[PDB]
Amino acid sequence: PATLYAVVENVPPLRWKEFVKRLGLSDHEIDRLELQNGRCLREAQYSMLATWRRRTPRREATLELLGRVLRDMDLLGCLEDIEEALC
Numbered sequence: 574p575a576t577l578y579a580v581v582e583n584v585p586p587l588r589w590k591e592f593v594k595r596l597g598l599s600d601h602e603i604d605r606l607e608l609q610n611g612r613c614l615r616e617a618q619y620s621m622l623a624t625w626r627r628r629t630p631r632r633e634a635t636l637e638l639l640g641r642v643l644r645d646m647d648l649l650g651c652l653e654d655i656e657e658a659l660c
Contacts (some may be wrong), residue, residue, distance in 0.1 A: 576636040577622035581615050583606030584648065589618050595642040598625060 584592050586631045593603050598621065606624070626635050636655065643652045 575585045575624075575658050576639075577619060579658035580622050580636065580639055583651035583655045584618070584636050584643075585642065586618060589621070590647060592642060592648075595641075595645055596621065596625065598629070602628070602659050626629055627634075 594600065602624075603621070605615050606620045608619055608625075609620050622635070622639070625631075629635075629638075631638065636652075636659075640652045643649060
């Protein structure tokens with residue numbers, strides 16, 4: 574969960590969907606995330622990091638898949654900040 578808060582802050586909100594597209598989650602589910610709760614953008618972005626752990630069958634390394642997305646988006650600096658959150 575703490576890593577999810579880091580990804581929500583380190584990753585930009587406006588381009589979050591693009592970051593989500595790099596995540597590989599169903600594109601249509603991404604649009605539905607706003608319906609789940611758009612009153613709180615952090616809750617929406619958190620929905621991706623939270624719903625992903627639930628909907629995706631990833632037993633562990635949830636940030637790992639996200640980290641690879643960061644590297645593709647040149648967000649390695651952000652992962653280091655997110656990594657600091659875990660530490």
